């Protein structure tokens, strides 16, 4: 992939960049609990057919 | 000043234009901040900016209105009021983005026998209410 930046194809000004990639680190991208299943139980009398 | 300089008598010169006044009440710099170009540490679009300088930073006079006993007041928005003013307007319509400061000079003379008082307000984000 061609590693270009804007100053390679247009005239640019000087900008002091403050943005960061902190929220897209692998850790941050996954740092959330996700539902993987729902288990069902009951508390019923056990009877011969159930 | 003992050389005669007065709070009341001013001259403003921007580009090819000059305003004189002999009955000023000093002048205001909003929030104490003079206009400035965008600093690199606050910059956001990365392309080289255009800065038309004297071609756009000059005094444009709008259509004169009339004050009477029935007048309730007038309003304008910036940059809207200048959208058709020479190369400033052109630069505005040719570019996605633009920023600008302004010197606003409201003019109204009368006589020592007239009376009345106009409040002249510069409001940031002057959202007005609708008719509905």
Curated annotation (Swiss-Prot), chain A:
Intracellular or extracellular location(s):
Virion; Host cytoplasm
| Assembly and binders | Interacts with capsid protein VP0, and capsid protein VP3 to form heterotrimeric protomers. Five protomers subsequently associate to form pentamers which serve as building blocks for the capsid. Interacts with capsid protein VP2, capsid protein VP3 and capsid protein VP4 following cleavage of capsid protein VP0. Interacts with human PVR.
Could you tell me what this protein does? Forms an icosahedral capsid of pseudo T=3 symmetry with capsid proteins VP2 and VP3. The capsid is 300 Angstroms in diameter, composed of 60 copies of each capsid protein and enclosing the viral positive strand RNA genome. Capsid protein VP1 mainly forms the vertices of the capsid. Capsid protein VP1 interacts with host cell receptor PVR to provide virion attachment to target host epithelial cells.
- The protein depicted here goes by the name Capsid protein VP1
Q: Give the organism the record lists.
A: Poliovirus type 1 (strain Mahoney)
Swiss-Prot record, chain B:
Q: Which residues of the full protein are shown?
A: 74 to 205 of 2209
Indicate where this protein resides in the cell.
Answer: Virion; Host cytoplasm
What functional role does this protein have? Forms an icosahedral capsid of pseudo T=3 symmetry with capsid proteins VP1 and VP3. The capsid is 300 Angstroms in diameter, composed of 60 copies of each capsid protein and enclosing the viral positive strand RNA genome.
Subunit structure of this entry? Interacts with capsid protein VP1 and capsid protein VP3 in the mature capsid.
State what protein this is by name.
Capsid protein VP2
């Amino acid at each position: 992939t061609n590693p270009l930046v804007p100053s390679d194809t247009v005239q640019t000004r000087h900008v002091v960049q403050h943005r960061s990639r902190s929220e897209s680190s692998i850790e941050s991208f996954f740092a959330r609990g996700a539902c993987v299943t729902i288990m069902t139980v009951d508390n019923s009398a056990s009877t011969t057919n159930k | 000043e003992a050389c005669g300089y007065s709070d009341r008598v001013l001259q403003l010169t921007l580009g090819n234009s000059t305003i004189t006044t002999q009955e000023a009440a000093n002048s205001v710099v909003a929030y104490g901040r003079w206009p400035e170009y965008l600093r690199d540490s606050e910059a956001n679009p990365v392309d080289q900016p255009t800065e038309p300088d004297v071609a756009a930073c000059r005094f444009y006079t709008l259509d004169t209105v009339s004050w009477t006993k029935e007048s309730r007041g007038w309003w304008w928005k910036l940059p809207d009021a200048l959208r058709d003013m020479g190369l400033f307007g052109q630069n505005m319509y040719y570019h996605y983005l633009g920023r600008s400061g302004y010197t606003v000079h409201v003019q109204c003379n009368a006589s020592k026998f007239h009376q009345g008082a106009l409040g002249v307000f510069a409001v940031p984000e002057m959202c007005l209410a609708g008719d509905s």
